[PDB]
Amino acid sequence: XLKAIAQEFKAIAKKFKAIAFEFKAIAQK
Amino acid sequence: XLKAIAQEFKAIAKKFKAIAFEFKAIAQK
Amino acid sequence: XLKAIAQEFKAIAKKFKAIAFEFKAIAQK
Amino acid sequence: XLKAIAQEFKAIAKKFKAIAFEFKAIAQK
Amino acid sequence: XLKAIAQEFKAIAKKFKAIAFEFKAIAQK
Amino acid sequence: XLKAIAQEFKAIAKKFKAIAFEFKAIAQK
């Protein structure tokens, strides 16, 4: 397993935070 | 928009932090 | 827990329709 | 597009609610 | 379940890959 | 961006496919 799945969601969480980030950038420009 | 888009993906990402957190807890228990 | 997991993904699916709605408007305007 | 994109996130929202409902099943029995 | 979960996540992964595809197409367009 | 968003979703698809594959292992065992 379950630790692998947990870290999979943690990595997906970083990826979605970065997606929100880059969407803030594209929202401005 | 796109600012609402960014903030809602931010919320979704924080929900994956919660998800990961939950799987760590159930991983041993 | 097991209830909590289904608890967040209910709201998560709740949000994806908001994403749909938003890009629905962006596609038009 | 963007119409397909918004349509696809609507489908994703439909998938996730079933996913949650599915963990609801395992939460009981 | 758990088979439904596995196939469901595989399907949503395929859908996200498809969306990545249209965003790659629209990046140049 | 748009390319970064597409590659983010491509990574999302890869991790979700891995998760889907993984849950099948728990399903058998």
Side-chain angles (χ1 to χ4, degrees):
Chain A
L2 277 296
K3 61 92 176 178
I5 300 301
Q7 63 84 30
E8 290 292 327
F9 292 100
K10 187 183 287 185
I12 294 287
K14 277 76 70 177
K15 292 315 198 41
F16 264 120
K17 208 184 278 204
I19 293 171
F21 263 95
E22 63 186 0
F23 271 64
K24 293 185 287 292
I26 191 171
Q28 296 327 92
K29 245 59 198 58
Chain B
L2 277 296
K3 181 69 176 177
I5 287 300
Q7 63 84 30
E8 65 183 1
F9 292 102
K10 183 170 319 195
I12 297 169
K14 82 177 190 291
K15 295 183 289 294
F16 305 91
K17 276 74 70 177
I19 297 169
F21 173 66
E22 200 281 334
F23 292 101
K24 301 131 181 173
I26 62 170
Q28 292 83 18
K29 248 61 220 60
Chain C
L2 274 300
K3 174 276 161 183
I5 301 103
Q7 188 274 331
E8 70 274 15
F9 301 80
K10 176 181 193 24
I12 297 166
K14 165 153 301 303
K15 296 135 190 163
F16 291 106
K17 65 182 181 293
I19 296 89
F21 256 114
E22 174 63 28
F23 292 100
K24 183 178 179 180
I26 299 299
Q28 304 325 107
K29 250 65 181 62
Chain D
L2 187 63
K3 293 179 179 179
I5 301 296
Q7 181 270 333
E8 191 277 333
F9 292 100
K10 182 179 178 182
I12 288 294
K14 318 280 297 193
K15 317 304 292 213
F16 269 102
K17 77 182 189 298
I19 296 168
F21 270 104
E22 186 67 26
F23 321 121
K24 305 188 61 152
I26 195 67
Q28 300 292 61
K29 242 73 184 45
Chain E
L2 276 298
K3 325 295 280 303
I5 299 300
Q7 63 84 30
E8 189 75 2
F9 283 68
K10 173 166 309 305
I12 64 170
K14 163 168 319 194
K15 300 289 94 176
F16 292 166
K17 186 164 58 47
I19 301 299
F21 277 118
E22 293 84 4
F23 291 166
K24 288 186 286 291
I26 199 173
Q28 60 90 17
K29 226 64 224 64
Chain F
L2 277 296
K3 204 72 197 51
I5 295 91
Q7 63 84 30
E8 291 315 314
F9 291 166
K10 192 71 178 295
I12 301 299
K14 293 293 185 290
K15 316 304 279 295
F16 279 20
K17 156 169 311 174
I19 289 182
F21 173 66
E22 172 59 17
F23 291 167
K24 183 178 179 180
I26 296 91
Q28 294 300 320
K29 229 58 207 60

